[PDB]
């Protein structure tokens, strides 16, 4: 069954894409064009964090919006404390290339993981001595991209094989499987109920996962180009998505389709990292021309430029209660905005 | 009390520093070789006293563009090859033209006529390698034909940036052409070229 | 999504020539480098041709050096692949795909391991 199957998906995607039409009865700009925007919202570098040697390519922050854990590609996992610009903990590795890192919600275990596919979990107690690998979790066949704890028991691994799966610490087994994509898979983020959640994958379609459900509940098949960035607006409903494209196709759960696509015409680049702020409204992307524009949710207006760093941005996080904005570069810095 | 937390602080820091120091001590030491043609193949050697962490990928799912990236901050790429051939000079060709591999410089390695490649019987041979004895003519012409061909692939629109290196089969020219990419890199540092 | 659909296909004669249309919608086509990619049966998937966003940039496998011809249409959204002089082992399924980052010349849609912006393919058998 090939060929009337072929058709008969052929209609049903037709069908998909006529009652979005139906649904999109007018743009999200034309009804909200009548809102006020707040204006050009200029920022100013106040850290500058001085301890790393090969480039930085994840970052992650806290829930106390006071620390945060920097992953180079030397081997070093290194806490960084933000107020008081000085240092914590410094994990090392037997590998190199660090291509994930997180925090956990309570603040007590932090993840790790490159293309050695060793997702290892560094305690924050230290009671004997040294920091120290609690359980591994490598099951993987592929690589490792972005991890993101759910909570201190379990934390879900996207992964370069296809295979997204979520992992108990204490089994070193996978709890649930979900295979739905077809390419890999880049980046995922996190509703703040920490039940839903999403999987940026490089076939442009993100799709909507759960925990409780073990399959997919929508597929948002709107981009282009392969998808880098992916990030939960605050509410929990929607989510916006970053490609390489030069377009921030922003998505809603329950509406079903795009709302809106930041197409700059100066603009012939890739975006790296997006995130929301505690409002929401300032939409703060990682471009790759050398520059992070912050752009607005409602409007579609450039409100700022973060130029400070000198080579590419690659993760760009927000506190939990909008203090600071941190952005990892490929220049070994971390400057810190405000 | 701010001023005990504040000097325990202090004194935790100088000393993650000097792990930092010790750290970069060795991390300049260390020299990086990406290896392609556990889920990575570390290969730990020393050659003249000289940190060669070789670095080659196995079961890996090879969509290669979101992973490569990670590797601008190796200083050579080994790319060994030996139909498979058309497929490496696209591959090569990929890995020279991307946006951020314009500072990595490949080593390029060659091994192993008519039928996959008719033009190359209108090739002018030049005599300015000595050949190895008992070599067949036609497959010398050949073997200097592919590596023409990846030599106009390199040249063709290389940046100056970073330059290719076929070689034919030790570690000893991977030494020497570690050495090279080395000193090149410097004197684009120093701008005397 | 990228949809793309291709032209042609059924049994032919070695030496008779064909257009390969490839129906390609929902995407800017002046921003991306496309190219074609044939999958022998038993034989691994291997590149054939491409065209640049202007048209200039036209290289060809060294095997099949002038006798295929590569066109692109930017008003009506198409790549037009004209198969000339003909050789019965040259048949395979024909994807027509497309380079994933735009204004660049780095491509990676060689690998089998389900490269998902190919295209479905149509078997021209010769």
């Known amino acids: 069954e090939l060929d009337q199957l072929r058709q008969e998906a052929e209609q049903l995607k037709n069908q998909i894409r006529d009652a979005r039409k139906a649904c999109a009865d007018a743009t999200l700009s034309q009804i909200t064009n009548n809102i006020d925007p707040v204006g050009r919202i200029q920022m100013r570098t106040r850290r500058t964090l001085r301890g790393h040697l090969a480039k930085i390519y994840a970052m992650h922050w806290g829930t106390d919006s006071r620390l945060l854990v920097s992953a180079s590609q030397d081997g070093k996992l290194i806490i960084w404390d933000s107020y008081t610009t000085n240092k914590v903990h410094a994990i090392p590795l037997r590998s190199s290339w660090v291509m994930t890192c997180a925090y956990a919600p309570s603040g007590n275990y932090v993840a790790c993981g490159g293309l050695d596919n060793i997702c290892s979990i560094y305690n924050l107690k230290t009671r004997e001595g040294n920091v120290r690998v609690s359980r591994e979790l490598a099951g993987h066949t592929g690589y490792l991209s972005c991890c993101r704890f759910l909570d201190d028991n379990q934390i879900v691994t996207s992964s370069g094989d296809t295979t997204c799966a979520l992992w108990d610490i204490e089994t070193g087994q996978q709890t649930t499987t979900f295979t739905g994509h077809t390419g890999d898979v880049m980046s995922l983020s996190l509703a703040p109920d920490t039940r839903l959640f999403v999987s940026g994958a490089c076939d442009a379609s993100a799709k909507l996962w759960d925990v409780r459900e073990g399959m997919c509940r929508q597929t948002f098949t709107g981009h282009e180009s392969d998808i880098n960035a992916i990030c939960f607006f605050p509410n929990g409903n929607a989510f916006a998505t970053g490609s390489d494209d030069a377009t921030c196709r922003l998505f809603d759960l329950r509406a079903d389709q795009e709302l809106m696509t930041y197409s700059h015409d100066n603009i012939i680049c890739g975006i790296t990292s997006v995130s929301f702020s505690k409002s929401g409204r300032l939409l703060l992307a990682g471009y790759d021309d050398f520059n992070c524009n912050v752009w607005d949710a409602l409007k579609a207006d450039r409100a700022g430029v973060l130029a400070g760093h000198d080579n590419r941005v690659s993760c760009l996080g927000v506190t939990d209660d909008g203090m600071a904005v941190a952005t990892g570069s490929w220049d070994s810095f971390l400057k810190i905005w405000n | 009390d701010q001023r005990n937390e504040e000097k325990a602080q202090r004194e935790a820091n100088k000393k993650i520093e000097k792990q930092l120091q010790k750290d970069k001590q060795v991390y300049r030491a260390t020299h990086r070789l990406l290896l392609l043609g556990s889920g990575i193949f570390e290969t730990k050697f020393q050659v003249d006293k000289v940190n060669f962490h070789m670095f080659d990928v196995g079961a890996q799912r090879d969509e290669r563009r979101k992973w490569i990236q990670c590797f601008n901050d190796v200083t050579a790429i080994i790319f060994v090859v030996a139909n498979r051939l058309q497929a490496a000079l696209k591959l090569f060709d990929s890995i020279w033209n991307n946006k951020w591999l314009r500072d990595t410089s490949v080593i390029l390695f060659l091994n192993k006529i008519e039928d996959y490649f008719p033009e190359f019987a209108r090739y002018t041979t030049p005599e300015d390698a000595t050949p190895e004895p008992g070599e067949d003519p036609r497959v010398t012409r050949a073997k200097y034909f592919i590596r023409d061909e990846f030599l106009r692939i390199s040249t063709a629109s290389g940046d100056g940036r970073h330059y290719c290196y076929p070689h034919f089969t030790n570690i000893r020219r991977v030494f020497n052409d570690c050495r090279d990419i080395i000193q090149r890199m410097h004197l684009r540092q120093y701008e005397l070229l | 999504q990228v949809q793309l659909q291709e032209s042609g296909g059924g049994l032919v004669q070695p030496g008779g020539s064909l257009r390969l249309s490839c129906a390609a919608s929902?995407?800017?086509?002046?921003?991306?480098?496309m190219n074609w990619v044939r999958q022998a049966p038993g034989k691994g998937l291997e590149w054939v041709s491409d065209?640049?966003?202007?048209?200039?940039?036209?290289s060809y496998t060294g095997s099949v050096k002038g006798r295929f011809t590569i066109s692109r249409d930017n008003a009506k959204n198409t790549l037009y692949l004209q198969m000339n002089s003909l050789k019965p082992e040259d048949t395979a399924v024909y994807y027509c795909?497309?380079?994933?980052?735009?204004?660049?010349?780095?491509?990676?849609?060689?690998?089998?391991?389900?490269?998902?912006?190919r295209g479905q393919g149509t078997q021209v058998t010769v």
């Open positions: 795909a497309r380079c994933p980052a735009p204004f660049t010349r780095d491509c990676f849609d060689v690998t089998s391991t389900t490269y998902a912006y």
């Open positions: 065209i640049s966003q202007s048209g200039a940039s036209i």
């Open positions: 929902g995407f800017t086509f002046s921003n991306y480098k």
